Design an enzyme around this catalytic site. Structure first.
Site, PDB file in Angstrom:
ATOM      1  N   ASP A  25       0.802  -1.219   0.000  1.00 21.89           N
ATOM      2  CA  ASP A  25       0.000   0.000   0.000  1.00 21.89           C
ATOM      3  C   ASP A  25       0.843   1.282   0.000  1.00 21.89           C
ATOM      4  O   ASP A  25       1.311   1.770   1.016  1.00 21.89           O
ATOM      5  CB  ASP A  25      -0.871  -0.035   1.241  1.00 21.89           C
ATOM      6  CG  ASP A  25      -1.946   0.989   1.162  1.00 21.89           C
ATOM      7  OD1 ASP A  25      -1.860   1.819   0.226  1.00 21.89           O
ATOM      8  OD2 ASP A  25      -2.864   0.944   2.012  1.00 21.89           O
ATOM      9  N   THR A  26       0.963   1.876  -1.209  1.00 20.28           N
ATOM     10  CA  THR A  26       1.749   3.093  -1.340  1.00 20.28           C
ATOM     11  C   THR A  26       1.071   4.276  -0.689  1.00 20.28           C
ATOM     12  O   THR A  26       1.711   5.287  -0.437  1.00 20.28           O
ATOM     13  CB  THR A  26       2.018   3.420  -2.822  1.00 20.28           C
ATOM     14  OG1 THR A  26       0.734   3.574  -3.508  1.00 20.28           O
ATOM     15  CG2 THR A  26       2.771   2.305  -3.520  1.00 20.28           C
ATOM     16  N   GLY A  27      -0.221   4.198  -0.392  1.00 24.95           N
ATOM     17  CA  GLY A  27      -0.959   5.265   0.256  1.00 24.95           C
ATOM     18  C   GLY A  27      -0.891   5.206   1.755  1.00 24.95           C
ATOM     19  O   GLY A  27      -1.517   6.079   2.401  1.00 24.95           O
TER      20      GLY A  27
HETATM   21  C1  LIG Z   1      -0.095   6.279   9.379  1.00 26.54           C
HETATM   22  O1  LIG Z   1      -0.164   5.090   8.639  1.00 26.54           O
HETATM   23  C2  LIG Z   1      -1.352   4.856   8.026  1.00 26.54           C
HETATM   24  C3  LIG Z   1      -2.415   5.736   8.075  1.00 26.54           C
HETATM   25  C4  LIG Z   1      -3.609   5.423   7.418  1.00 26.54           C
HETATM   26  C5  LIG Z   1      -3.718   4.247   6.698  1.00 26.54           C
HETATM   27  S1  LIG Z   1      -5.146   3.940   5.722  1.00 26.54           S
HETATM   28  O2  LIG Z   1      -5.386   2.495   5.660  1.00 26.54           O
HETATM   29  O3  LIG Z   1      -6.204   4.807   6.269  1.00 26.54           O
HETATM   30  N1  LIG Z   1      -4.880   4.443   4.180  1.00 26.54           N
HETATM   31  C6  LIG Z   1      -4.467   5.833   4.035  1.00 26.54           C
HETATM   32  C7  LIG Z   1      -4.949   6.528   2.782  1.00 26.54           C
HETATM   33  C8  LIG Z   1      -6.452   6.497   2.509  1.00 26.54           C
HETATM   34  C9  LIG Z   1      -6.942   7.856   3.028  1.00 26.54           C
HETATM   35  C10 LIG Z   1      -5.699   8.705   3.030  1.00 26.54           C
HETATM   36  O4  LIG Z   1      -5.752   9.935   3.165  1.00 26.54           O
HETATM   37  N2  LIG Z   1      -4.626   7.975   2.814  1.00 26.54           N
HETATM   38  C11 LIG Z   1      -4.270   3.485   3.272  1.00 26.54           C
HETATM   39  C12 LIG Z   1      -5.173   3.147   2.099  1.00 26.54           C
HETATM   40  O5  LIG Z   1      -4.475   2.440   1.051  1.00 26.54           O
HETATM   41  C13 LIG Z   1      -6.391   2.322   2.483  1.00 26.54           C
HETATM   42  C14 LIG Z   1      -6.038   0.881   2.890  1.00 26.54           C
HETATM   43  C15 LIG Z   1      -7.316   0.133   3.280  1.00 26.54           C
HETATM   44  C16 LIG Z   1      -7.952   0.442   4.506  1.00 26.54           C
HETATM   45  C17 LIG Z   1      -9.121  -0.256   4.838  1.00 26.54           C
HETATM   46  C18 LIG Z   1      -9.679  -1.204   3.990  1.00 26.54           C
HETATM   47  C19 LIG Z   1      -8.997  -1.559   2.814  1.00 26.54           C
HETATM   48  C20 LIG Z   1      -7.868  -0.841   2.483  1.00 26.54           C
HETATM   49  N3  LIG Z   1      -7.339   2.316   1.396  1.00 26.54           N
HETATM   50  C21 LIG Z   1      -8.488   2.993   1.372  1.00 26.54           C
HETATM   51  O6  LIG Z   1      -8.838   3.777   2.286  1.00 26.54           O
HETATM   52  O7  LIG Z   1      -9.196   2.804   0.254  1.00 26.54           O
HETATM   53  C22 LIG Z   1     -10.544   3.319   0.296  1.00 26.54           C
HETATM   54  C23 LIG Z   1     -11.451   2.440   1.170  1.00 26.54           C
HETATM   55  C24 LIG Z   1     -12.061   1.378   0.271  1.00 26.54           C
HETATM   56  C25 LIG Z   1     -11.574  -0.020   0.538  1.00 26.54           C
HETATM   57  C26 LIG Z   1     -10.329  -0.143  -0.312  1.00 26.54           C
HETATM   58  O8  LIG Z   1     -10.531   0.744  -1.421  1.00 26.54           O
HETATM   59  C27 LIG Z   1     -11.586   1.674  -1.152  1.00 26.54           C
HETATM   60  C28 LIG Z   1     -11.095   3.115  -1.112  1.00 26.54           C
HETATM   61  C29 LIG Z   1      -2.670   3.354   6.682  1.00 26.54           C
HETATM   62  C30 LIG Z   1      -1.517   3.615   7.393  1.00 26.54           C
END
Ligand SMILES: COc1ccc(S(=O)(=O)N(C[C@H]2CCC(=O)N2)C[C@@H](O)[C@H](Cc2ccccc2)NC(=O)O[C@@H]2C[C@@H]3CCO[C@@H]3C2)cc1
Ligand SMILES: [Cl-]
Ligand SMILES: [Cl-]
Ligand SMILES: [Cl-]
Ligand SMILES: [Cl-]
Ligand code: NA
Ligand code: NA
EC number: 3.4.23.16
Lengths: 99, 99
Positions: A25-27
């Protein structure tokens, strides 16, 4: 390898003696793993994303094998819906995004 | 380009004639953008992130430039803390993960 993005980029990891599936996860700034025991000291942290924040335990200097590549770093443990390998460990295995 | 992950993979996007910053996010299935006006009709969608579910507006077939690559596809608008470019558009720009 080269991993395309037609599907979620899931890989096998080994952490704390346990094999798990996790998302590359690059995000994600940090690595966040579903609740499990890890050895050593921890401290509480909040991490936020879509939907708000969760409380996690921050464990430092944890070794994780990622798709057969060893990496050490901080791992956050808490009620994440999916195991996430974030940038702090993606850098250590030399991962890049290419287009 | 080849983008390393020591920093957040932030790029310029252009949508609705406006430049914005967005995060290339391989852990996102969908592209989620902060509140803005888009043309046409929208449909409902629930998005489940790390902290829970949010409601978003789903707009299909939206023209969007990403790091100078042209995409046309689905954009979700809602309260995300950061604009995120998910896999639906990363595939359109030909992005892969490599290590
Ligand atoms: C400080 O370290 C972290 C902080 C936050 C996160 S995160 O999981 O909230 N997220 C951060 C992103 C999303 C919001 C932002 O400003 N940056 C990592 C994401 O890759 C996250 C990773 C993720 C979190 C929860 C479920 C699945 C994936 N994916 C995600 O939110 O995707 C959204 C939700 C929907 C499900 C997947 O795709 C759809 C779009 C991870 C580590
Ligand atoms: Cl955070
Ligand atoms: Cl670290
Ligand atoms: Cl490097
Ligand atoms: Cl799309
Ligand atoms: Na430790
Ligand atoms: Na539309």
């Amino acid at each position: 390898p080269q991993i395309t993005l037609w599907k979620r980029p899931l890989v096998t990891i080994k952490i704390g003696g346990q094999l798990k599936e996790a998302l590359l996860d690059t995000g994600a700034d940090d690595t966040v793993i579903e609740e499990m025991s890890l050895p050593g000291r921890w401290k509480p942290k909040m991490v936020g994303g879509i939907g708000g924040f969760i409380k996690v335990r921050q464990y430092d200097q944890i070794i994780i094998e990622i798709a057969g590549h060893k990496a050490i770093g901080t791992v956050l443990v808490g009620p994440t819906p999916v195991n996430i390998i974030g940038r702090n460990l993606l850098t250590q295995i030399g991962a890049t995004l290419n287009f």
